[PDB]
C-alpha cells in the first residue's frame, strides 16, 4: 500500500518536488509559526479543517523522531542523517499545511505552479525576486476524536495487535479509501499520516543498525493510533468511545472481583 | 486538573483571598453556626440547594483532617495555618450564601474588599457588615448510606490513583466548568480537593517526622475510594443503576459459590 | 496577573516577534509621524477609536519614562543604552502598531505581520531582496476623552490615593476576566491595560537603576491617579466619579473651620 501524504488536498508528492530542498524553513522556524497563529485551534477539542488534523499528526511525528534521534545519541552523526532524509519530509508537511491554513487551499496550489515556472527558466531570463506567499505546544492526538491519551492508558500494553499486523488490517479493509483523492472521514485524514509516520520511522530504525527498544516506546504509541482509527471506522465512531469507558471500569477493578474475560469490541 | 471549589457559584479563589486572612471566623464559630440553622437541612435526604451539597462535604472533609491531626500528634499546629484558612473560607462563604443569598455575598466580597484598600480617612467609618434587616451522611441525599456502600467488600473499590485519572479522562472538561451540571458534579468537585489537601498534609508529616501513608490508606483512603467510585459510576451509568448494582453485587458475594452465577455482576453500557 | 497589550486588538505579543528588533523606526521618527497625521484627533476629547485610547497612553508612557532616564543621568550615559534595549524597543512596537493600525486599518496590519513572517522564515537564497512593506489602505491629556482633566484631579491630595500594590490588587481581584479577555468592553479597560503595563516598565527600570525612592512621589503618583480613576469609572460608573470630582473640589478649596471634617465619600 502506497499512500500519498497530500493527495486529498489536491497536490502530489512530485508536484511539491518543484520546490528545491533548501527552500523550506527550519523546523524551529516552522513550529513557532504554527504555534503563533494556530495554538487555540490546534489544542481545540474539535477538528476545524482537514489541514488541522493533518498538521496535528505532523507535529507529533516530529516529536517521536526527535525523541528517537537523541536516544541513539546516548547509546553526534545521527542528527546529520535525520535532517537530510526524513527531517526534510517533515519540513514539507509542516510548510504545506501551515500555508494551507493561512493562504487558502488553492493559493498555495497555485504557488507551486507559480514557483514551478520560476525555478525552471534559465537564470538569464529570471526575475531576481522569487515568488512568495503574498497578502491573503503539547497537543493531544485523540483530542478532536473525543478520547484522550489518558483514556488509552487504561488499555494494557499487550491489548493492541502488532504494528505489522495492524498495517495489514488497514491495507486489506481500507485500501482504495486511503489511496483516494478524497477524505471521506476525519479518520482517514488522521490514519494516512500514521502510516507514513511509522514508515518514515522504520527507515531510521533500519539505518541506525548500520537494541530494538522502539517496539515498546514508539511502536506502542503507533499501535494506539492504528488501533483507534481502524476501530473508529470498523465498529462505528462512538461505539469505541463507549467501549474504552467499559474497559476502564473492567481494568480498574482488582482481581477476584472482575469477570476473567475482558470485554470484547463488537457490533 | 485544577478544580476551583467556588467556580460554579460565580466566585474565584482569588476573590475570596481579596479579603484579609484574619477576617474569617474560627471553625468552631462557623460549624456551630451551620448546626444552629441548617442541622435540620444538612441532614435531610434532599439537596434543596447546591450550597448544601457543597457544605456537607466541607464539614466532612474537616472531620477527616481532625481525625488525622489527632493521629499524627498521638503517634509521632500546621493545619490551622495552611489547611485551616482554606476550610474557614468554605464554611463562611456557603453559610452566607444560604443566609443572605448568593448574589448579596458576591457583591459583599467586592464592596468590603475595596474598603480595606481605601485609606482610612476617605472611606466609610464602619466596615459594611452584611445583614438583611451534628453528624451528616454524604450519600443520604443521593439514596445510599454508608452502610450500603460498606455492604460491598472493602477491597472491591480500585486504587486512588486509578480513580482520579478516570475523572480526568471522562469529565475533566466538566468538573472545571463554571456551572454545576449535576449534584453529583458538585459533590465530586469537593472530593478531589478533599483528597488533595489530605495528601498535602501527608507529605508534610512525611518530611517532618512511612507509617502515615500506611495509616491514611487504611481508614481515610478507603473512605475516599467509596464516594470516588460512587460518584464516577453515577455520572457514567446513572444514579438509578448504581443503587441496584450495590444490591445485586452485595447479595452475590454473600451466596455460596455453588448456587451463585459463575461470574461476578459488573456494570456496563 | 499577566496582562497583554495587543491581545485585545487581535495580535499577540509573540506574533509581533515575527518582526526583528531592528525593524521598527525610532521613537523620534514615530512621534513625528503621529503628530503630523493625528494631532487634531489625539488631543481631541473624543473616543474616536480604541487605537487612539491605546496610543494616547503609549505616548505618555514614553513621556514619563524619558523623564526618569533624564533624571538618573544627573544623580548617580550608562542608562540610555539600557532604556533603548529593554524599554524603547518594547515601546517602539506599541507605537509602530497603533500608528500603522490607524493608518492602514487594523486587518491589514494583521495580514502584514503574517506576510513579514513568510519573508523572514525563508532562507536568504530564495527570499526577495525587497521587504514586503505596506503602503495601501505635542501634549496629551490622558483623561480628556473621559470627561475629566489633569487639573481636575490635582485637587485630590497626595495622601488620598492608595498605594500602587493596593491598587493593582484591586484590579486583578475585581477585573481580571475582563482585562485579560480579547474584547474591549469599555474605553476604560483599554486605558487600564496600558497603565498597568507602563507600571511594569517603570518598576523594571527602577530595579536596574538600583543595580530612587522618588518614583512613587513624582511618577508613581501619576500612576496612582490613573489607576484610581479607571477603577472607579468601572466600579461606580463614569458619570458618578466625574460628579464626585467637582464635589471634592468645593470641599478641598474651602479653608478649615468652614468645611465638614468628613470628606464626601464615593457611594452607589
Author numbering:
A (entry chain D): 1 to 75, 195 to 255, 285 to 358, 375 to 431
B (entry chain L): 1 to 76, 199 to 255, 285 to 360, 372 to 431
C (entry chain E): 1 to 76, 195 to 255, 285 to 358, 375 to 431
Reproduce the article's own wording on this structure.
Notably, as a result of the tandem arrangement of VelcroVax, the T = 3 configuration does not conform to icosahedral symmetry. Each VelcroVax subunit comprises two connected HBcAg monomers, only one of which is modified with an Affimer, generating an imbalance between what would be true icosahedral asymmetric units. As such, this configuration was termed T = 3* rather than T = 3, and 5-fold (C5) symmetry was imposed during image processing rather than icosahedral symmetry (I1), which was imposed for the T = 4 VLP. Freshly purified VLPs were used for cryoEM data collection, and structures were determined for both T = 4 (at 2.9-Å resolution) and T = 3* (at 3.6-Å resolution) configurations. The T = 3* reconstruction was less well resolved than the T = 4 reconstruction, likely because 5-fold symmetry was imposed during refinement to account for the unique symmetrical arrangement of T = 3* particles. Both the T = 3* and T = 4 reconstructions had clearly resolved density for residues corresponding to the helices of both HBcAg molecules within the tandem VelcroVax sequence. Unsurprisingly, given the presence of flexible linking sequences, the SUMO-Affimer, the second MIR, and the internal Gly-Ser-linker lacked clearly defined density. For both T = 4 and T = 3* VLPs, maps low-pass filtered to 10 Å revealed additional density above the four-helix bundles consistent with the expected size of the Affimer, confirming that Affimers were likely present but were not resolved to high resolution. Because of its unique symmetrical properties and therefore much more limited chance of success, focused classification was not attempted for T = 3* data.
